[PDB]
Amino acid sequence: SLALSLTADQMVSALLDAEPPILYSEYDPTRPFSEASMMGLLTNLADRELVHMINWAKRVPGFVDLTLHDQVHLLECAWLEILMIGLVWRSMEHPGKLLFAPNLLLDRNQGKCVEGMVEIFDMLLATSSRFRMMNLQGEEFVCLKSIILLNSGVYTFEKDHIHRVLDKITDTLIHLMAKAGLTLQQQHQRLAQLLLILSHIRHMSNKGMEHLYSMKCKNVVPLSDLLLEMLDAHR
């Protein structure tokens, strides 16, 4: 392979270099939100971000080693978790707000613009707060996002290779913590803290998927073909 021979420093560099761009919303700030316009803006953003996600995934060491079909399955499983961890990271230094885009920064109460969305906002905000509590580092974040991509769908399948790469990312996280001056005990504790947050991200994705499906049914706004296919992969 190639990912398996990467050093920890090289893994970090690779993941940092692979980062997708931060996209803007087409939001016109002179007009108040409606349920329809809000969902429109949010889903338009997701659709555009998905295209860049595919490019990023291809640059995650080890991902390209998998069959096309396995790559498809992992992204289908993990796409919303991946968008969400991105959002939570961006919103870290904005307590009480969700930075969907630099020009789309939403307060908790703006979640009530859309039926059923505020509960999802509350979970996302709680995750952002936790990241803040922990002083999550950018290098840690990119490791976590890659773990989500490789792990989320690996049990619904190749697999041994994914697990070897996952082990390398764990090694990378520990390396970062060691570099940061953490004791062995602190490293293990922090590793666990970070990985347990992925359970909450999974939970949020599942709830988000149900919400997006309901908004699709209500027919609030029309989703893109890609979004529709990515959504349909979960049912």
Partner: peptide, 8 residues
């Protein structure tokens, strides 16, 4: 699927 083509 569109995801299929994008990956290619």
């Amino acid at each position: 699927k569109i995801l299929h083509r994008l990956l290619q």
